[PDB]
Write an enzyme that holds these catalytic residues in place. Structure first.
Site, PDB file in Angstrom:
ATOM      1  CB  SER A   1      -0.878  -0.008   1.261  1.00 40.05           C
ATOM      2  OG  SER A   1      -1.555   1.221   1.483  1.00 40.05           O
TER       3      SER A   1
ATOM      4  CE1 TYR B   1      -5.158  -2.372   4.579  1.00 34.54           C
ATOM      5  CE2 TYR B   1      -4.846  -0.134   3.887  1.00 34.54           C
ATOM      6  CZ  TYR B   1      -5.064  -1.448   3.589  1.00 34.54           C
ATOM      7  OH  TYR B   1      -5.163  -1.825   2.274  1.00 34.54           O
TER       8      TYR B   1
HETATM    9  N1  LIG Z   1      -8.990  -1.635  -2.805  1.00 35.50           N
HETATM   10  C1  LIG Z   1      -7.784  -0.799  -2.935  1.00 35.50           C
HETATM   11  O1  LIG Z   1      -7.822   0.259  -3.534  1.00 35.50           O
HETATM   12  C2  LIG Z   1      -6.443  -1.272  -2.316  1.00 35.50           C
HETATM   13  C3  LIG Z   1      -5.351  -0.444  -2.350  1.00 35.50           C
HETATM   14  C4  LIG Z   1      -4.152  -0.869  -1.820  1.00 35.50           C
HETATM   15  C5  LIG Z   1      -4.065  -2.126  -1.233  1.00 35.50           C
HETATM   16  N2  LIG Z   1      -5.163  -2.946  -1.184  1.00 35.50           N
HETATM   17  C6  LIG Z   1      -5.024  -4.265  -0.607  1.00 35.50           C
HETATM   18  O2  LIG Z   1      -5.466  -5.223  -1.802  1.00 35.50           O
HETATM   19  C7  LIG Z   1      -5.925  -6.356  -1.261  1.00 35.50           C
HETATM   20  C8  LIG Z   1      -7.408  -6.548  -1.675  1.00 35.50           C
HETATM   21  O3  LIG Z   1      -8.159  -5.368  -1.355  1.00 35.50           O
HETATM   22  P1  LIG Z   1      -9.671  -5.252  -1.767  1.00 35.50           P
HETATM   23  O4  LIG Z   1     -10.116  -3.823  -1.603  1.00 35.50           O
HETATM   24  O5  LIG Z   1      -9.948  -5.738  -3.167  1.00 35.50           O
HETATM   25  O6  LIG Z   1     -10.404  -6.181  -0.618  1.00 35.50           O
HETATM   26  P2  LIG Z   1     -11.927  -6.505  -0.410  1.00 35.50           P
HETATM   27  O7  LIG Z   1     -12.301  -5.910   0.903  1.00 35.50           O
HETATM   28  O8  LIG Z   1     -12.748  -6.059  -1.582  1.00 35.50           O
HETATM   29  O9  LIG Z   1     -11.958  -8.105  -0.359  1.00 35.50           O
HETATM   30  C9  LIG Z   1     -11.156  -8.807   0.634  1.00 35.50           C
HETATM   31  C10 LIG Z   1     -11.517 -10.260   0.485  1.00 35.50           C
HETATM   32  O10 LIG Z   1     -10.878 -10.896   1.453  1.00 35.50           O
HETATM   33  C11 LIG Z   1     -11.947 -11.860   2.092  1.00 35.50           C
HETATM   34  N3  LIG Z   1     -11.513 -12.152   3.443  1.00 35.50           N
HETATM   35  C12 LIG Z   1     -11.609 -11.357   4.546  1.00 35.50           C
HETATM   36  N4  LIG Z   1     -11.105 -12.031   5.601  1.00 35.50           N
HETATM   37  C13 LIG Z   1     -10.682 -13.257   5.144  1.00 35.50           C
HETATM   38  C14 LIG Z   1     -10.089 -14.338   5.800  1.00 35.50           C
HETATM   39  N5  LIG Z   1      -9.786 -14.385   7.172  1.00 35.50           N
HETATM   40  N6  LIG Z   1      -9.763 -15.469   5.108  1.00 35.50           N
HETATM   41  C15 LIG Z   1     -10.010 -15.550   3.763  1.00 35.50           C
HETATM   42  N7  LIG Z   1     -10.587 -14.480   3.096  1.00 35.50           N
HETATM   43  C16 LIG Z   1     -10.927 -13.339   3.812  1.00 35.50           C
HETATM   44  C17 LIG Z   1     -13.090 -11.219   2.026  1.00 35.50           C
HETATM   45  O11 LIG Z   1     -14.243 -12.148   2.077  1.00 35.50           O
HETATM   46  C18 LIG Z   1     -13.022 -10.485   0.669  1.00 35.50           C
HETATM   47  O12 LIG Z   1     -13.593 -11.231  -0.358  1.00 35.50           O
HETATM   48  C19 LIG Z   1      -5.820  -6.173   0.225  1.00 35.50           C
HETATM   49  O13 LIG Z   1      -4.632  -6.681   0.739  1.00 35.50           O
HETATM   50  C20 LIG Z   1      -5.811  -4.607   0.350  1.00 35.50           C
HETATM   51  O14 LIG Z   1      -5.287  -4.328   1.702  1.00 35.50           O
HETATM   52  C21 LIG Z   1      -6.350  -2.542  -1.741  1.00 35.50           C
END
Ligand SMILES: NC(=O)c1ccc[n+]([C@@H]2O[C@H](COP(=O)([O-])OP(=O)(O)OC[C@H]3O[C@@H](n4cnc5c(N)ncnc54)[C@H](O)[C@@H]3O)[C@@H](O)[C@H]2O)c1
Ligand SMILES: NC(=O)c1ccc[n+]([C@@H]2O[C@H](COP(=O)([O-])OP(=O)(O)OC[C@H]3O[C@@H](n4cnc5c(N)ncnc54)[C@H](O)[C@@H]3O)[C@@H](O)[C@H]2O)c1
Lengths: 280, 280
Positions: free
Chosen positions: A163, A176
């Site tokens: 991130s 986070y």
């Molecule tokens: N969305 C963004 O813009 C963004 C930016 C930078 C980093 N990230 C990181 O990218 C990755 C995905 O982000 P996202 O926004 O698409 O996430 P999201 O919130 O849309 O989805 C996360 C998924 O993880 C699942 N999950 C939660 N706890 C779990 C567990 N204990 N075991 C198995 N599955 C579990 C959830 O059911 C969900 O489907 C993450 O690591 C996030 O921190 C996202």
């Protein structure tokens, strides 16, 4: 599709958090590499939706209900995957994210805050633990299970998701931010640990992305851009939010040994120049 | 060839330092994108050798004698290129390198070194100037000439070449380390400066690579590494030198908007894990 440029036929890609916004998009594109795709998520229905779309599009995928914080559950899932597809070649640790219990309402402490404001002093220990567990142990434990199977395999590699916070923390989100600093660190640690047995480890650090899941959060309840959204645009040189599709090239680059055999322990920003800018 | 995955037909790639070891290799591979390649070098013969090989294989290339420190020369070459191919789409600033007068013989000072050893105190002002001129102005002046033409062109972008020595300096080579730190900085500056008109700027930081030209510098001890080579290998997690081929993926990733549209101001290490390790 640029993913069609990369032939991963007969390889197995294991993706955790596969039902999420970024990973579900990316999983669907990775199907065009001809890889087998295992979609792991706590929410089986969300992952199964992705599996159906992949299979309907001519690919090969299956969803597995998995809790990445429960080692023996991951091990059971690994055995089911071995029956269905075989053993891991590429592991994408997509499970992660933040939650309100570890988030403040206020950017900065002030002497005149409303009593209802959730400040730093109101963050619960369990909320902080929840975020660190999911974003660090939720990558480490699947890595323990699946990297064991990758040992020795030509072209094996691990992708973590970092991130902007890992570079410089953002306001309001201490846990986070700390957990993503830790996963950036772990990426480098793993790259070194596995450097004699041929498993690369790298990370993608997405910048500020928009999707239909977070679009409303960029506006206040009257439909004006939030101050935070305006700060993001101000401090992003390319002057926009990114899209999920803009992560695909970086992912393909890092997982394909023909492109990145000597790229190891890198945290690659995909951020419109955000981390290259001073603000001044 | 992975370069064939990337359709740059009828685009113009301008490569400075094109007769050099890395850039000549990379220019030959970039020809498979079907781009027109202009090969700029102070050594015309070296660049023309590459042009002849590219053309023999069915590619499109021409060499141009250029001094990247002489603005009026670069402008004359730009005019010639316009006649032959057209105007710049992608600029790769490959001109660079060190000078012995800006290098010490010893890694660290000691008392009672013999008179023959070239120490920090023997570093020559003109040699230091030469290294900074070539590695910083030698990128800035061609960027002034060719970015003018890239304005308004979808997908235009600039690549600089940095180094490990930009992150933390290497022993014996202060000027080269400083000048590459400066070009890493300039890469970020350019990314920001051009961020509202659609010209990305990124850099590749190759780690320690082996070539036909330096093999006998790294393995002097017949085929046992030199002492410096052993320092490099022991501090590289993957325990080997990189090859020129292992920079191509990163280059294609960064110059192709389909892969890296939101990747801007990045300095990408291709280094076998070197930057992720501290030797302990
Ligand atoms: N969305 C963004 O813009 C963004 C930016 C930078 C980093 N990230 C990181 O990218 C990755 C995905 O982000 P996202 O926004 O698409 O996430 P999201 O919130 O849309 O989805 C996360 C998924 O993880 C699942 N999950 C939660 N706890 C779990 C567990 N204990 N075991 C198995 N599955 C579990 C959830 O059911 C969900 O489907 C993450 O690591 C996030 O921190 C996202
Ligand atoms: N070779 C490596 O392993 C390595 C590692 C890290 C960074 N780099 C950097 O990669 C780039 C290429 O390195 P290389 O080893 O292939 O170089 P090289 O010495 O093999 O070739 C450099 C080329 O630049 C030309 N040149 C010198 N002065 C010039 C001038 N004033 N105008 C126009 N051309 C000029 C030379 O004629 C030569 O052909 C350089 O920026 C280098 O600093 C190289």
């Amino acid at each position: 599709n640029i993913a069609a440029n990369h032939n991963l036929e007969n390889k197995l890609i294991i993706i955790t958090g596969a039902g999420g916004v970024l990973c579900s998009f990316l999983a669907k594109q990775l199907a065009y590499t001809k890889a087998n795709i295992a979609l792991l998520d706590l929410n089986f229905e969300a992952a199964d939706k992705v599996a159906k779309e992949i299979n309907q599009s001519g690919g090969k995928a299956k969803a597995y209900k998995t809790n990445v914080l429960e080692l023996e559950n991951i091990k059971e899932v690994r055995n089911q995957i071995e029956t269905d597809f075989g053993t891991c070649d590429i592991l994408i640790n997509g499970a992660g994210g933040n939650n309100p219990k570890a988030t403040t309402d206020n950017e900065f402490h002030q002497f005149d805050l409303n009593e209802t404001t959730r400040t730093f002093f109101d963050l619960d220990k369990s909320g902080i633990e929840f975020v660190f567990n999911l974003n660090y142990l939720g990558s480490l434990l699947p890595t323990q299970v699946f990297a064991k199977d990758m040992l020795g395999k030509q072209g094996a590699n691990i992708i973590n998701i970092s991130s902007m916070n890992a570079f410089t923390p953002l306001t309001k989100i201490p846990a986070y931010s700390g957990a993503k600093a830790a996963i950036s660190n772990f990426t480098q640690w793993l790259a070194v640990y596995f450097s004699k047995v041929g498993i690369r480890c790298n990370a993608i650090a997405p910048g500020f992305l928009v999707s239909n899941q977070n679009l409303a959060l960029l506006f206040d309840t009257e439909g004006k851009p939030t101050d935070r959204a305006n700060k993001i645009l101000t401090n992003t040189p390319m002057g926009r939010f990114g899209e999920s599709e803009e992560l695909l090239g970086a992912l393909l680059f890092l997982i394909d040994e023909n492109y990145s055999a000597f790229v190891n322990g890198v945290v690659l920003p995909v951020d419109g120049g955000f981390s290259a800018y001073s603000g001044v």
